[PDB]
Amino acid sequence: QVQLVESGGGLVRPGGSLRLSCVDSERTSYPMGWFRRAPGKEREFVASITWSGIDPTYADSVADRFTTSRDVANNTLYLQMNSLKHEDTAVYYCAARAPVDYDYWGQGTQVTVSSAAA
Amino acid sequence: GSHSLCPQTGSPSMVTAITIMALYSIVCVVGLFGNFLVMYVIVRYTKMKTATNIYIFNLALADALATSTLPFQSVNYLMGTWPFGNILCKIVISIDYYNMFTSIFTLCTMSVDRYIAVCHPVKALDFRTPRNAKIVNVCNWILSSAIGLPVMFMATTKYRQGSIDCTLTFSHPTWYWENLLKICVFIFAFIMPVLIITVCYGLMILRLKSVRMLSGSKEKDRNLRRITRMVLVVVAVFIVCWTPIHIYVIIKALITIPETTFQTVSWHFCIALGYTNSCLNPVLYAFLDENFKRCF
Ligand SMILES: CC(C)CCC[C@@H](C)[C@H]1CC[C@H]2[C@@H]3CC=C4C[C@@H](O)CC[C@]4(C)[C@H]3CC[C@]12C
Numbered sequence: 001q002v003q004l005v006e007s008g009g010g011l012v013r014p015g016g017s018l019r020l021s022c023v024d025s026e027r028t029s030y031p032m033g034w035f036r037r038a039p040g041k042e043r044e045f046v047a048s049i050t051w052s053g054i055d056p057t058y059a060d061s062v063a064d065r066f067t068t069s070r071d072v073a074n075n076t077l078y079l080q081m082n083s084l085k086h087e088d089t090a091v092y093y094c095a096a097r098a099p100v101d102y103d104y105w106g107q108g109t110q111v112t113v114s115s116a117a118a
Numbered sequence: 119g120s121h122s123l124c125p126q127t128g129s130p131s132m133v134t135a136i137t138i139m140a141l142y143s144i145v146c147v148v149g150l151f152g153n154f155l156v157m158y159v160i161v162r163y164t165k166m167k168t169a170t171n172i173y174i175f176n177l178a179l180a181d182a183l184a185t186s187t188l189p190f191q192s193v194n195y196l197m198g199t200w201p202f203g204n205i206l207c208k209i210v211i212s213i214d215y216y217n218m219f220t221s222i223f224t225l226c227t228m229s230v231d232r233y234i235a236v237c238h239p240v241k242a243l244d245f246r247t248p249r250n251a252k253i254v255n256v257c258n259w260i261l262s263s264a265i266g267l268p269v270m271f272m273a274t275t276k277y278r279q280g281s282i283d284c285t286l287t288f289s290h291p292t293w294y295w296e297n298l299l300k301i302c303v304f305i306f307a308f309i310m311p312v313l314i315i316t317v318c319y320g321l322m323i324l325r326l327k328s329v330r331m332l333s334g335s336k337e338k339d340r341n342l343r344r345i346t347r348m349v350l351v352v353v354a355v356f357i358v359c360w361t362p363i364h365i366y367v368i369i370k371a372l373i374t375i376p377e378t379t380f381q382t383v384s385w386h387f388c389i390a391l392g393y394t395n396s397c398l399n400p401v402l403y404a405f406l407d408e409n410f411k412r413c414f
Pocket of ligand 1: 363366380
């Protein structure tokens, strides 16, 4: 069944930027949400966006710094993360709806905010 | 140049004056109420951390300021003269032009923002930040100042048949610069906005209608129907509210129309329609907004 490919994660310096993206290239689902889980913590909502790509919804703790968009023509979801902080270190998961909660979850990507970066 | 003062007599029927007053009152009250309510809901609950709320806030403040001029305009109508002196003439004229343009530029902005989201999603990631929405509001205010500030200098009271017009004085020759002003207002407040929102929303709909998905699909039809209907409503409201006063102002620049009850009444009605846009904007752009909708 569905296979979400997340890209763009990894190591960033505090205050830096990363762009995540996620696609279901099969057009079998619509990547629409982003969640994350910091080590020791519970899964938390980050952002989502409607089908049309018009209306994003951000978690309060990320509204000032994160933007999300959807490319409806190739079913790609993006998350632009700016001004990154230790608090943002987490595994980030893409979530998708079936064309017919969320139905599908990526395996996640590690975002690590550390000064030991480059 | 006759501005605030309508060359009137014979003095009106009871019913036409009640009507016009009621018109100005209702629009003012409904405008002040709806827009204060949006501002309150933003400042209290939603908080202004997002671009969309920053645009909503700017729109509501402008719309609330636009409507705040109406009591001055009812009294001016009711008394057949401007009683508030030269300083208030400048301030109210200025506020009225500034906020017509702020209101209109912010609502264009919201159209462009939506077009960007759907048609340029990658660039949307840079464009749709709270920081950019603030810069955009400042830029729009700058643009609005190109008319808002000169009118502050040009506005003055002068005598006009014993009575008092709150009017615009122009450099020589007055017949050039006064008509240029009318023209500019007509193209920046009406023509350009109509083109912007119809092109941005029409291109948005076109991209949406072009999407396939092996499965889809009834869900896609459904969505497009809701979005298209919303586009048609916001455009139709803009057009119904603003076209009458715009056209009327041009017609008066060009020909001399017989003073009659119908002329007087239709004029105030067209003026009220303009301010009615400011009354409906809270509905169209706040209360029907996806996220804002959710509170309370
Ligand atoms: C929904 C939109 C497109 C409708 C636009 C209708 C506009 C063009 C209408 C509404 C009110 C109309 C005005 C009402 C009264 C008069 C007085 C008359 O002595 C000359 C025509 C004139 C000045 C009309 C011109 C056209 C007018 C401005």
